Amino acid sequence: GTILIDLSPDDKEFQSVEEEMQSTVREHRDGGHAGGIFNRYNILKIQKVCNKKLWERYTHRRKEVSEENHNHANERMLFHGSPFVNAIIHKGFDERHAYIGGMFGAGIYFAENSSKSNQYVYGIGGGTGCPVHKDRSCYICHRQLLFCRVTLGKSFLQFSAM
Amino acid sequence: AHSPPGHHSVTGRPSVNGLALAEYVIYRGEQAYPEYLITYQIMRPE
Numbered sequence: 001g002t003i004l005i006d007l008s009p010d011d012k013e014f015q016s017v018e019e020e021m022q023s024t025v026r027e028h029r030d031g032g033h034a035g036g037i038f039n040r041y042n043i044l045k046i047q048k049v050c051n052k053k054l055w056e057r058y059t060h061r062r063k064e065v066s067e068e069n070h071n072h073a074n075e076r077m078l079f080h081g082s083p084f085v086n087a088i089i090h091k092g093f094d095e096r097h098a099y100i101g102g103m104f105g106a107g108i109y110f111a112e113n114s115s116k117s118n119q120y121v122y123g124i125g126g127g128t129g130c131p132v133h134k135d136r137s138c139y140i141c142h143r144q145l146l147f148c149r150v151t152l153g154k155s156f157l158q159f160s161a162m
Numbered sequence: 163a164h165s166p167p168g169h170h171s172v173t174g175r176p177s178v179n180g181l182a183l184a185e186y187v188i189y190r191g192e193q194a195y196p197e198y199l200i201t202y203q204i205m206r207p208e
């Protein structure tokens with residue numbers, strides 16, 4: 001069901017998505033160990049993900065949540081990085097595959113820092129890094145993140161020791 | 163795993179590092195839509 005529509009670098013949408021990527025990079029306490037060492041990205045491609053069914057499933061739920069929360073979906077745009085990205089664009093997100101407990105338990109994780117999502121593209125802690133070079137700081141191999149529309153509803157506030 | 167009762171998600175907010183932004187968790191696939199696929203390289207600092 002999913003089609004991917006390539007956006008052109010002078011599309012305003014390409015530009016605002018890239019700026020959100022670039023501007024939400026921070027330093028990490030592992031000094032780069034998981035996600036590698038960098039201050040910015042080289043964006044290679046941005047594709048709009050279009051799946052009528054996943055969209056309808058999303059908005060239907062968005063509406064339920066909104067009604068439970070004084071007509072406030074609390075919709076954000078957030079990064080997701082993991083090895084599940086190729087499956088997710090085809091099947092949508094599936095909490096049944098999101099069973100590993102993180103800082104905030106089992107579930108589907110998103111980040112405001114693109115660079116945080118980048119730590120997970122090759123697995124937990126960066127796994128063994130890129131498939132080709134086994135290098136968590138690989139500057140050659142292509143990475144993929146998703147920039148997602150996420151319904152938070154009434155969000156439980158969990159202060160972290162981080 | 164499920165949302166704490168009476169919530170639809172969890173916000174994981176760093177209390178120590180002031181420069182770190184929030185992470186969030188949801189427990190239902192339908193509460194997110196993967197809207198953009200971004201392919202990129204990280205760049206070696208100068």
Ligand SMILES: COc1ccc(C2(CNC(=O)c3ccc(NC(=O)c4ccc(C)o4)cc3)CCOCC2)cc1
Nearest residue numbers: 082084087093094097098100101102108109120123124
């Ligand atoms: C193996 O690489 C991983 C990378 C990151 C994770 C963590 C976050 N995991 C997730 O965000 C997550 C894991 C799996 C999914 N999977 C799916 O949505 C999904 C749909 C269809 C398929 C096959 O998977 C969606 C989200 C686990 C908690 O510790 C922090 C990160 C877990 C595993």
Ligand SMILES: [Zn+2]
Nearest residue numbers: 130133138141
């Ligand atoms: Zn590599």
